[PDB]
Structure formats: structure tokens, C-alpha cells
Design an enzyme around this catalytic site. Structure first.
Site, short mmCIF file in Angstrom:
data_model
loop_
_atom_site.label_atom_id
_atom_site.label_comp_id
_atom_site.label_asym_id
_atom_site.label_seq_id
_atom_site.Cartn_x
_atom_site.Cartn_y
_atom_site.Cartn_z
N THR B 34 0.81 -1.21 0.00
CA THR B 34 0.00 0.00 0.00
C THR B 34 0.84 1.27 0.00
OG1 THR B 34 -0.10 0.10 2.42
CG2 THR B 34 -1.81 -1.17 1.29
N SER B 35 0.25 2.37 -0.45
CA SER B 35 0.95 3.64 -0.47
C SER B 35 1.09 4.12 0.97
CB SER B 35 0.17 4.67 -1.30
OG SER B 35 -1.13 4.86 -0.78
N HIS B 93 8.10 0.61 3.83
CA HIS B 93 7.52 -0.56 4.46
C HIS B 93 8.74 -1.38 4.86
CE1 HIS B 93 3.30 -0.11 3.51
NE2 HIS B 93 3.57 0.10 2.23
N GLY B 94 8.57 -2.30 5.80
CA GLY B 94 9.69 -3.13 6.19
C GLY B 94 9.31 -4.30 7.07
N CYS B 135 8.35 -1.04 9.63
CA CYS B 135 8.00 -2.14 10.54
C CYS B 135 9.18 -3.06 10.74
CB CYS B 135 6.83 -2.97 9.99
SG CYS B 135 5.26 -2.10 10.03
#
Lengths: 103, 147, 103, 147
Positions: B34-35, B93-94, B135
Site C-alpha cells: 500500500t501507499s 515498508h519493512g 515495521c
């Protein structure tokens, strides 16, 4: 005293030395971001840097960031699973000296 | 001269150093990611904050995993002799030990290895700071009422 | 300003807050110990605590430990694979305040 | 009264707190783990060092994975109301996220969870320090000559 692992003739430092990782959250945890105001961590980090970069050593600034994120933020979600959650940033220091942005 | 202690990093070089900001907001549809709405606010806040600390801020938006590695490699190959430190901010993100490019993951270790004391000699002995907003897993902290 | 994730009526802190992990070595690395003098990390930690516990904030003490281990120690081994190696401790802080052992 | 900042932990409680030292030197033959010669020197140095900082030092030698968990659980269940902090030192073989009992591994997370802010209320808001002397993997740092 004398030994086999100290006082080397040729001075060396660990290749992993002098690194600092300022993680937004604890190991294994999600990291929270407000779709309008930005992430809790970056918001707080910038705020503490703006206020203390010319006054405190970096680790102490990051400790203030830890407290700000930990106390002031709590998630809101229509999904009970993700509602009312907290976050604590994680400072990982392999630095060998104190760090001040000013001199 | 008088007594010298050497308890703090020398931060009076001609330049404070670079502050590389990787701002990944939009991800390839194929990844299903997701953005990250609101990340631009973070990127701008960081640019201004580090600008005031006298860092040479360079921003990059929506980089693929290949571009992230290429950027880091190129930056680590610059001559940082006149720079006091190095700062890299990763916004994406991660997962634990991972940061996502727009088309896939990048091991944080791969990124930081470029700056190892033996691989980036002009930064040896200088603080290398990596700020990571992503994350590190899927756990949620329920918190505890304070008293 | 106002939002959905700040200024909660009931104050809470992360359950993971206020923890400090002082690791002897960096993530993924071996940790060195002298069979006669003890581990490089514990040796150094005790030395810095004895010298600075009544003078410096804990993170700064641990930073001195990082420098001591990083600069003063290097392994010795008849096995080339384990010879001449270095080590850097790893401070992981989820603390929310400065910590002084004295008051 | 005057301005109050609250930037440092309250360390003036009646007691500084406990300093639990787990010293694993000898491991069960079945595990194939070698003895950790020199660890006693570490254990003694820690006891003296924390004794001088006014901690209630408690030492335990060669604990099985079961005994480690039992010890931590029992300690976390004590009333730490009058204690300023908590310290636990782990001396043993290890791997990333793991500390070894004399007969097998113990996840560090299992040990630290007992002290979570919501599980050990008398320590909520107080510093919980875990000092870990153990491997976190099999990588070796070749170092770099300084100049």
C-alpha cells in the site's frame, strides 16, 4: 599485566564500529504512521532535534524521542485488532564517542 | 597544549556531511504494498531539520530495490574526507532487518555494509547514522496504564 | 492541532518501554572471552562502571565501554580463521529517561 | 515548589534493586557445548562492581534452561515497589536472540517478557537492564587499521 589479546602494535577498530541505528520501533513490532501528520517517530525525532540539537548529546536527544513516542501516541483504528496500540523506538548504538551536532 | 580527552566525535570538519533521505511512498502494484500516506510530511520535516543542522540533504523518492543499492554504493564511494559524519534516513515498508524498495526488499545489512570501516575509508572513525521508519515485524504493543 | 492518536485521556506506556539491553557484540557476531581474564565486554563494563558510575549517565558509560572494547582488544588464535579479530559491543536502548546510578 | 523536569529515572528509592547474575560455565555433555573458562572472573567482577553501586546481587551458576525460566519468573513475581531498578546479567553460550541453559536454549524474549510493563507492575516505569555476554551469531570482524 600482559596478554595475547590487548595492546596491539598496529591499532585497528571493528569494521562495525561507529554505527548508530535509530529504529522507530522495537524488534519484531509494527511501526505507526499517521496518514496526515506523518510517522510518530519521525515527527518526534525532528521535534527533539529542533529543540535540543544545540544543547544535548545525541543519545540523550534520542532518549527524549523514546519518551515522547511512548507517552504521547496511541493508535486509533476501527479494527479492534489495531486499536489503542503503543510504540517504543529502539536506539541501537555501536558508537565509540559522544556525538554533539554543535561544537 | 593542555589535557586532551577525546570523548566526543570531531564534528568541526568543513562539512557536517550528507543526509540521504529515501522516501518510498508509492509501490509497484505487483508487490501488493500500500501507499504510505503522510510520508512526504516526514520527508519534508527531515529535510528542514537536518538543513538547520548544516547537513547536505539529498532526497530520493520511490526507489526500486536496485536503485536503493546503487544509490548507497555510489554515496559510499564519494570522498567524505571533509565531512564529519554520515546520515541516512529510510522511510518505507519493512520487516525485521529489511527495508522495501518499490519493487521488493533490500537487506538493511547490504545497505550498511557499504559504509563499513574497511569499505568506506573516508568515513572510518566517523559516526554513521541510519534512521529507520519501517515495521520490524507484526507484533502490537497493548501498552499499560501508568500510575 | 488535534488528532486521533495523541493526548489520550488515560495515559499508557508501551509494555516494551524502559528496557535496556547491553549486548557484548554486534548482531550476528561471535563474542570474545579470554580464558584467563574473562570476557572483553564484562572486563570493560566493570572497569568503566567503577570509574564513571558516580560521574556519567549510563549511556555515556556504555559508550566508553564500546570504545574500550573496540580499541584495546584483538583476538589471538593459532587458527587463522579466528585470529586477529575485533569486537564492538551493541547498546540497545528502549529507555525513556536518563539513568544515573547516583542521586 | 520550583520547576520540575523529570528527565532522569528516580533512583532514590530505598533499594537500588536486584542484580541477578546467571553464570553458566559447565554445560551438559549431551549438548556438546564447551566449558566457558574465565566466566567466573566475570561473575566475581560483576558481583563486586554492582555491590559497590548498592545493588542486591544474587548469583546462580550452571542453570538449566528450565531453571533459568523459573528463576526469572520467580524474580519478576517479587514486590519491587521499593526498588529503583532491575538488572540481569547473562553469561553463557548463545546465538542471535538466544542464551543457553546448561541443557539447551532459552529465547531471550521469554526471559524479558516476565518483566514487561504489564506483567511486572512494581517495575513499570523503572529501568530494566539486561547485560548479555554471549554470541549473537558466527560472524567475525576483521577490523580495519586506523589512521
Amino acid at each position: 599485566a600482559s596478554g595475547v589479546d590487548d595492546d596491539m602494535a598496529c591499532h585497528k577498530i571493528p569494521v562495525e564500529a561507529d554505527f548508530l541505528y535509530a529504529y522507530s520501533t522495537a524488534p519484531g513490532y509494527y511501526s505507526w504512521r499517521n496518514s496526515k501528520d506523518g510517522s510518530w517517530f519521525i515527527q518526534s525525532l525532528c521535534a527533539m532535534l529542533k529543540q535540543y540539537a544545540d544543547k544535548l548529546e545525541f543519545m540523550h536527544i534520542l532518549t527524549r524521542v523514546n519518551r515522547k513516542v511512548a507517552t504521547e501516541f496511541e493508535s486509533f483504528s476501527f479494527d479492534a485488532t489495531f486499536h489503542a496500540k503503543k510504540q517504543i523506538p529502539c536506539i541501537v548504538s555501536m558508537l565509540t564517542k559522544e556525538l554533539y551536532f554543535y561544537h | 597544549s593542555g589535557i586532551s580527552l577525546d570523548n566526543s566525535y570531531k564534528m568541526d570538519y568543513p562539512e557536517m556531511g550528507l543526509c540521504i533521505i529515501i522516501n518510498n511512498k508509492n509501490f509497484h502494484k505487483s508487490t501488493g504494498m500500500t501507499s504510505r500516506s503522510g510520508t512526504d510530511v516526514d520527508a519534508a520535516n527531515l529535510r528542514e531539520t537536518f538543513r538547520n543542522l548544516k547537513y547536505e540533504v539529498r532526497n530520493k523518492n520511490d526507489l526500486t530495490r536496485e536503485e536503493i543499492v546503487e544509490l548507497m554504493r555510489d554515496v559510499s564511494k564519494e570522498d567524505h574526507s571533509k565531512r564529519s559524519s554520515f546520515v541516512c534516513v529510510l522511510l518505507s515498508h519493512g520487516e525485521e532487518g529489511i527495508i522495501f524498495g518499490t519493487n521488493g526488499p533490500v537487506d538493511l545489512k547490504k545497505i550498511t555494509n557499504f559504509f563499513r570501516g574497511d569499505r568506506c575509508r573516508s568515513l572510518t572513525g566517523k559516526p554513521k547514522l541510519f534512521i529507520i521508519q519501517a515495521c520490524r515485524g507484526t507484533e502490537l504493543d497493548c501498552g499499560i496504564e501508568t500510575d
